Ligand binder design. Structure first.
Ligand SMILES: Nc1ncnc2c1ncn2[C@@H]1O[C@H](COP(=O)(O)OP(=O)(O)O)[C@@H](O)[C@H]1O
Ligand SMILES: [Mn+2]
Ligand SMILES: [Mn+2]
Ligand SMILES: [Mn+2]
Lengths: 13, 326
C-alpha cells in the first residue's frame, strides 16, 4: 500500500 | 477473575508491535469493549496495569475495565472508542486546519498534564495512540512505554517510543523527564497542520535518527505566525529551552502561548468545547472508522505452540487478574 501517513510500531531497547 | 469465556469476539480492530486489539462484548451485561491482547513471548505489567487504573478517572484517557490472562497471552479489557484514531482520520483528511489541530492538541495537553502531574511519562504520543470518540473528542490509549513513579525532579534513561516521535534527548543518550511528551506533541502538531511528518519529507532508521537530531524543521509558508512559533517552541532540540519543559511553569507556558490563546482550558477539560469534526459512525459498531486491513482478518485467536509457550516464566504474571470496582 501507499499512504500519506504510515503506521509505525513502537520500539523499546 | 474474568476470562475469555465471558467475552464475545466480534471483530479485529487493531494491530501493533506488542498487541492485537479486538472488538469484544461482555456476554453477561451486553456492554461493548475493546480488548488489548498481548502475547507473553514479547513480554512493565506493574506499570501498564496501574496506568490503565489511573486513566479510568479522566475524560481524555482510555479506562481499564478488567484484566485477565491465559497461558500464552495477556488481556486488557478497556473502553471502545468507536470513532477510530487520528492516523486513520489523517490519511483521509491529509491535512488539518489550525483550528482543528489546536482543539486536539489542547485536549491532549490536558491529558498529558494529568499524567505528568501523577508521575507518569506517556512516551508514546503518536497518531495511532490518540482515538476519536463518537462525539468528536479524543482519548489516549496504549500505555506500553509509560514510566511510573516520577517524583519531582526525576529522570529515566530508557530508549523507547515510536521512531518518528523519539525526542533528541533520547537520541543523545541523555537522561530525560516529561520533556519527551511535549516533543512528541510537537511532532504530532506538525503532522496535523503541515500534513507530513517534519522528518520524513546509518541509512534508513538511523537516517531518520540523524535527521531528527541534525535536520532543521522547515515550517511551510502557509502556516500562521502563531502556529509556526508553537511548533518551533515544541520542536526545540534543547529540552531546557522547550515549551512545557519549564520547571513549575510548564503547563502554564503552554496555556499562555499565542497559539493556545483565546482557548478556554477549563471548558475544554469539562468537555464543553464543540469538536470541529464529528466522526461518521458507519457500519456495525462504527467499524467503518477502522482500517479494513484488520477488520477483514478472521475474528479468532492465533493457535498456540506448546513448545514456545512452555518457556514462559509464569511467576511474573501472578497478580494480573483484575476487575475494576466502578
Ligand atoms: N480502546 C480502544 N478503542 C478503539 N481502538 C483502539 C483501542 N485501543 C487500541 N485501539 C486501536 O488498536 C491499535 C493498536 O493498539 P495499541 O493499544 O496501540 O497496541 P500496540 O501497543 O501493540 O500498538 C491502535 O492504532 C488503535 O487504533
Ligand atoms: Mn498504538
Ligand atoms: Mn504499546
Ligand atoms: Mn471547520
Amino acid at each position: 500500500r501507499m499512504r500519506p501517513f504510515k503506521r509505525q510500531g513502537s520500539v523499546r531497547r | 477473575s474474568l476470562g475469555l469465556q465471558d467475552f464475545d469476539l466480534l471483530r479485529v480492530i487493531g494491530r501493533g508491535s506488542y498487541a492485537k486489539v479486538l472488538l469484544v462484548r461482555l456476554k453477561k451485561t451486553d456492554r461493548i469493549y475493546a480488548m488489548k491482547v498481548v502475547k507473553k513471548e514479547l513480554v512493565w505489567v506493574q506499570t501498564e496495569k496501574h496506568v490503565f487504573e489511573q486513566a479510568s478517572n479522566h475524560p481524555f484517557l482510555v479506562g481499564l475495565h478488567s484484566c485477565f490472562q491465559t497461558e500464552s497471552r495477556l488481556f486488557f479489557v478497556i473502553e471502545y472508542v468507536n470513532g477510530g484514531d487520528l492516523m486513520f482520520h489523517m490519511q483521509r483528511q491529509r491535512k488539518l486546519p489550525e483550528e482543528h489541530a489546536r482543539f486536539y492538541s489542547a485536549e491532549i495537553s490536558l491529558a498529558l498534564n494529568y499524567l505528568h502531574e501523577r508521575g507518569i511519562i506517556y512516551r508514546d504520543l503518536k497518531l495511532d495512540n490518540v482515538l476519536l470518540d463518537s462525539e468528536g473528542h479524543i482519548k489516549l490509549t496504549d500505555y506500553g512505554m509509560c514510566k511510573e513513579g516520577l517524583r519531582p525532579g526525576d529522570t529515566t534513561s530508557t530508549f523507547c517510543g515510536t521512531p518518528n516521535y523519539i525526542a533528541p534527548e533520547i537520541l543523545r543518550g541523555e537522561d530525560y523527564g516529561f520533556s519527551v511528551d511535549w516533543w512528541a506533541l510537537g511532532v504530532l502538531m506538525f503532522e496535523m497542520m503541515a500534513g507530513r511528518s517534519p522528518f520524513d519529507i546509518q541509512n534508513t532508521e538511523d537516517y531518520l535518527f540523524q535527521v531528527i537530531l541534525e535536520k532543521q524543521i522547515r515550517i511551510p509558508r502557509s502556516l500562521s505566525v502563531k502556529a509556526a512559533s508553537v511548533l518551533k517552541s515544541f520542536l526545540n532540540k534543547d529540552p531546557k529551552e522547550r515549551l512545557g519543559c519549564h520547571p513549575q511553569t510548564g503547563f502554564a507556558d503552554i496555556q499562555g502561548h499565542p497559539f493556545f490563546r483565546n482557548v478556554d482550558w477549563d471548558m475544554m477539560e469539562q468537555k464543553q468545547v464543540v469538536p470541529p469534526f464529528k466522526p461518521n459512525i458507519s457500519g456495525e459498531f462504527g467499524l467503518d472508522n477502522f482500517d479494513s486491513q484488520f477488520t477483514n482478518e478472521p475474528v479468532q485467536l492465533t493457535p498456540d505452540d506448546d513448545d514456545i509457550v512452555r518457556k514462559i516464566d509464569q511467576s511474573e504474571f501472578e497478580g494480573f487478574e483484575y476487575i475494576n470496582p466502578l
